[PDB]
């Protein structure tokens, strides 16, 4: 089953506007293989990823998730993003973290316009338990059992400078694969769109 | 301790004249703040001796 899980497939889609302030949190991502939010209109469908199709058929997962951020600028936009990883779980009050406080956590910057387009953000396995449970079968929360190993924040590091005859925003795709993935204890479950 | 931290964000305009000072910042005082991970090493020690890498 590593034939499907090691394929980077699209999970998210967010714009980087020119009308946002420095330090504003653009998007927050829960760090688990069960995350996807894309959908289609005709036909009515909920676009699964190749990693969330294999991992939904197990109880416990473990490994290093690899996020891939592909930008679509021209040669004339100019800006930076800050990709921060706050270790923890999928329920922490994370919106109070300022831009200067986010550099305490392990992070990485990215210059947008250049000859390369993709930054690969391999998240290390940080946990207190050796494995992490598929809790989405249940319907109530419980302190101690979780699905994620933290949340990933995207900041506006430098503003987006551009001329007048280009568009005033840059869109970023988010891909999702896994290295050193280990799953066991099978079940059946059909996932759902994380509406965030 | 040895990890890049964002310390300042300025913006360069067409109205700033020649030799105008876009950023004037103390480097070591801005790294001595609670929001960075290096504070947990510097809050409890007294003296230090260090080199600086700027980007």
């Amino acid at each position, epitope marked *: 089953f590593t034939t499907w899980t090691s394929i980077p497939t699209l999970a998210a889609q967010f714009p980087f506007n020119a009308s946002d*302030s420095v330090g504003q949190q653009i998007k927050v991502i829960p760090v688990d293989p069960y995350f996807f939010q894309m959908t289609n209109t005709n036909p009515d469908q909920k676009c699964i990823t190749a990693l969330a199709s294999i991992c939904q058929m197990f109880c416990f997962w473990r490994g290093d998730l690899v996020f891939d951020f592909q930008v679509f600028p021209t040669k004339y936009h100019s800006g930076r993003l800050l990709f921060c990883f706050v270790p923890g779980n999928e329920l922490i009050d994370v919106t*109070g*973290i*300022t831009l200067k406080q986010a550099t305490t956590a392990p992070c990485a910057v990215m210059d947008i316009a250049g000859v390369q387009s993709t930054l690969r953000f391999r998240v290390p396995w940080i946990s207190d338990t050796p494995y992490r449970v598929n809790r989405y079968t249940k319907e109530a929360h419980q302190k101690g059992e979780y699905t994620a190993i933290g949340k990933l924040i995207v900041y506006c590091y430098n503003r987006l400078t551009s001329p007048s005859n280009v568009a005033h925003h840059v869109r970023v795709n988010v891909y999702l694969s896994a290295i050193n993935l280990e799953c066991f204890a099978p079940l059946y479950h059909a996932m759902d769109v994380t509406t965030q | 301790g040895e990890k890049f931290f964002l310390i300042h964000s300025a913006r360069w305009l*067409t109205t700033h004249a020649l030799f105008h000072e876009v950023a004037k910042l103390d480097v070591v005082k801005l790294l001595y703040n609670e929001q960075f991970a290096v504070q947990g090493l510097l809050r409890y020690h007294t003296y230090a001796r260090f080199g600086i890498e700027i980007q």
Partner: antibody
Amino acid sequence: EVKLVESGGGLVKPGGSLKLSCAASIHTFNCYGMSWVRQTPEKGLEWVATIDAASSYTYYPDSVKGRFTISRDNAKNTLYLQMSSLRSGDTAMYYCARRDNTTAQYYFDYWGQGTTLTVSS
Amino acid sequence: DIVLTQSPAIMSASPGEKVTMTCSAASSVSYIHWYQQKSGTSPKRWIYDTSRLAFGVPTRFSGSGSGTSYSLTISSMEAEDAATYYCQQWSTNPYTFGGGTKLEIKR
């Protein structure tokens, strides 16, 4: 474009209780903390509440602590301000605002239209 | 527990002159923000941390100062600026705003 639309508000006798409700829009409601700011025509302004992403952490100043209660519903994208034990100091204009991050501190980008509360008998 | 006092309360201005207002604190404050309130509406995105202009604002407004004294400087006055300008802190708990400086067009 962010569109915050307040609702509720009117005439309450001093001693009654009323619940306000702001309403969110296109941009993501969980990524930001919200607030309530008070406009009197004589003096201004005074901030009264802020609740974070989840409904866990709430913050209040010295005056309205114990009287007011802020809440969220993250599926309905609405705010709620539960005001109890009203008096003559609460006849003013109430805005819902969105608190956002800067490099070192916080800042309110987008405010609502504002509803009017008149507390007198 | 900490008070922001704006030293001009009402100011008149001719179109094309230099306009400067002040928001003084009572202790050391790191950053002070600004808001513009035109008559009949709500305040807007005006000036974040100290000198950081917002997006849609004109490029002839300024901000400076540190510690106690802080200022908002207008290079060339126009007719689109007849409004009220509040200041705000974020250091300690009460988050006290400024009293308000009303800028009106001199005729």
